[PDB]
Amino acid sequence: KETAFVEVVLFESSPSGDYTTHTTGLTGRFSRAGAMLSAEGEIVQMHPLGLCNNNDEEDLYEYGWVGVVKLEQPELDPKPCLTVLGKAKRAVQRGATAVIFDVSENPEAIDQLNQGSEDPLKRPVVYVKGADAIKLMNIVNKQKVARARIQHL
Amino acid sequence: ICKGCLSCSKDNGCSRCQQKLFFFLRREGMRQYGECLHSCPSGYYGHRAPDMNRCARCRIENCDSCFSKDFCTKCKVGFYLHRGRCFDECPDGFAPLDETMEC
Amino acid sequence: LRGCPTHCHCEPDGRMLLRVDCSDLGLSELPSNLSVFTSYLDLSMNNISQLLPNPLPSLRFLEELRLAGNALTYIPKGAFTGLYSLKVLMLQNNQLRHVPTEALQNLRSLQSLRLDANHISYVPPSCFSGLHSLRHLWLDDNALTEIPVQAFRSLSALQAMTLALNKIHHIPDYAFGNLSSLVVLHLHNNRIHSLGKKCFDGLHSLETLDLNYNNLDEFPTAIRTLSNLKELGFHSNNIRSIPEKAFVGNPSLITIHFYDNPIQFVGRSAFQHLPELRTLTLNGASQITEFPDLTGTANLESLTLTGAQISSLPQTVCNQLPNLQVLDLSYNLLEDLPSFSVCQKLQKIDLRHNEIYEIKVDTFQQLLSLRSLNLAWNKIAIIHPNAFSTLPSLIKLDLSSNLLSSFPITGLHGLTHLKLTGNHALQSLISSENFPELKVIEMPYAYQCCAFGVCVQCSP
């Protein structure tokens, strides 16, 4: 419904103990699958297959991680362990302060995401696409660490 | 060079492995990507199933490589191996031998 | 400088020890001029037909040889003659149709041998002869038909073995005779129909057993002999019943799996003397008529037993069950209830679809950790006012379809979930106060939901 303003902040720990930063600007939109709230935290890319309850026990993550998930072409996975809704539910359960889906490959996820608006999650769920989604993945691919900043105007 | 994957991508790496390869989620900082390998990395063990072969981590204290969920293969530096368990002091019955750090 | 084969990558282990990696090069055959001092060799995915035109002994330092994903048909008998320090040999994803007849003999230092994901069927006797050090063995995803007892009888040093994803249909008596050191045994994803009554009498050190995803018809009574057994799995079989004194011979059992089994009858004294067992789950045991005795097993933290015909409970049942946390006895025929007060540390209770008619005073006293309580689909006519008085941590409650007329407000202050749908005699309204923090509500009439502000959620 409302536009989501994403700030990808790259940083460098100077030898003195101080930090120096470099801000990047992107734009997405809040799905009504999640809350309409601002959020911030350490970025953690998650592989789609990683978000399944099928696995009895998984790796632990430090609470407050901004999830980043690249969706695949619809016809490649016929039935997932959980739907795009359910995977966000797993992420928030596994300590995600927010979830950001790269939707370039699958637009049908938007209809599936906004389906469950009556029972929204605690935390915000956001989506991105196009040149904005490309910039995000270029930073995710090459850099070591980065802090995301989602704000709701 | 995403090798051994039937389906690959620059953003997720390997995906849905080729033939009879083990699928493994590797992490470096924030980034995560798939990998298709035949033998699991040090600190993990290969669990074979009909349609899902994955590398689960060894959660055995003082262990660097393991056979199963609860049987270590190689202990860490300064630890003696004995019946799949890693110890500091070698139990009674037999003494240590520091050539290979075992009992 | 120094003979590190062209195209390959080399690295030092300890000083003057060498680790080589020639994996995924697509080599027709191995390099001819190879340096001694190699303590690690990796030749994976190389399209190697045979070995060799010039095979290389005299590499006495070789600790780990990896030879996976190559097109190896057979192994010549004088292939690994030089390697006295070979500790770990990897031979997976090859097209071996059998274990090399005499090639793997007398590898004194060989501790691990991976022969999985091949097409092997036959294992010739004494092919593992002279393997004094062999601890670990992989033989999964192969075409085995039975246990090669004759070949395994030399392997006294074996500690782990995996015969999973094979076509093994029978385990004879004393099938693993001389394997005294064997700790782990994985036999899952086989066609194991029948096994002997003394089929596991050989191994004394066996701690874990995996009989999952198999075709067993009855409980495996070979278990009797296994004293050191800790973990046991035999889920997804066609086993029909657990006999009396089933786990009598296996104290110190910690984890057990047996789901996806059509278990109808279970012996009452079958689960006795299991002091380190923490969890128990029974679903759909219809032929259980009375509560099982749990003497010498007081450390159960999670007990769940559903789909049975249990009439009533012992009044000193909680003396046997301290340290218990969750208790699910749903879909049974329970009528009268004991104190439950000795069962402290209780957190969840689920007694839905029982035949309970009354909730007394003492039946739920001093359960300070109790959070959830489901009493849905019972015939509870009346509840004593102070029955839910001393439950401070109580948050979830479900009294759906109970035939209740009046409601006890005393205690139960500030609980989160309340379900009362089905109580048709419950016609009186409920105030917003005396019930803060209500997030999910079910109510038998719509006018009662209107009291809370709904024309937080409420379903009529």
Numbering used by the authors:
A (entry chain C): 53 to 205
B (entry chain B): 39 to 141
C (entry chain A): 31 to 485, 539 to 543
Question: Can I see the authors' text?
Answer:
In contrast, R-spondins (Rspo1-4) are the sole secreted potentiators of Wnt signalling and have emerged as crucial regulators of stem cell maintenance in vivo and in vitro. At the level of molecular mechanism Rspo proteins potentiate Wnt signalling by alleviating the feedback inhibition effected by the transmembrane E3 ligases ZNRF3 and RNF43. Although necessary, binding of Rspo to the E3 ectodomains is not sufficient to stop ubiquitination of Frizzled and enhance Wnt signalling. This further requires simultaneous binding of Rspo to the large leucine-rich repeat (LRR) containing ectodomain of LGR receptors 4, 5 or 6, which are well established GPCR-like regulators of stem cell function. The ternary complex between Rspo and its two receptors LGR4-6 and ZNRF3/RNF43 is established via extracellular recognition and triggers by an unknown mechanism its rapid internalisation.
To obtain insight into ternary complex formation with ZNRF3 we solved a low resolution hLGR5ecto–mRspo2Fu1-Fu2–mZNRF3ecto complex. This complex is very similar to the equivalent RNF43-containing complex in the overall positioning of the three different types of subunits. The RspoFu1-Fu2 fragment is sandwiched between the two receptor ectodomains which do not contact each other. Thus, a Rspo ligand serves to heterodimerize an LGR receptor with an E3 receptor in both flavours of ternary complex. However, as previously proposed by us the ternary complex involving ZNRF3 adopts a clear 2:2:2 stoichiometry in the crystal lattice due to dimerisation of the ZNRF3 ectodomain. Compared to the relative position of RNF43 in the ternary complex, each ZNRF3 subunit is rotated 30° away from its partner LGR5. We note that dimerisation of ZNRF3ecto and consequent 2:2:2 stoichiometry of the ternary complex would not be compatible with the exact arrangement of ligand and receptors as seen in the RNF43 ternary complex due to clashes of the membrane-proximal regions of the two LGR receptors (not shown). This rigid body shift in the position of the ZNRF3/RNF43 relative to LGR also requires a re-orientation of the Rspo2Fu1 domain to maintain the β-hairpin 1 and 2 mediated interface with the E3. It appears that the difference in relative orientation of the LGR and E3 receptors for the RNF3 versus ZNRF43 ternary complex renders this flexibility a necessity for Rspo to function as a cross-linker in both contexts. Our crystallographic LGR5–Rspo–ZNRF3 complex, albeit at low resolution, confirms the 2:2:2 stoichiometry that we had hypothesised would be favoured for ternary complexes involving ZNRF3, as opposed to the 1:1:1 stoichiometry seen for the corresponding RNF43 complex.
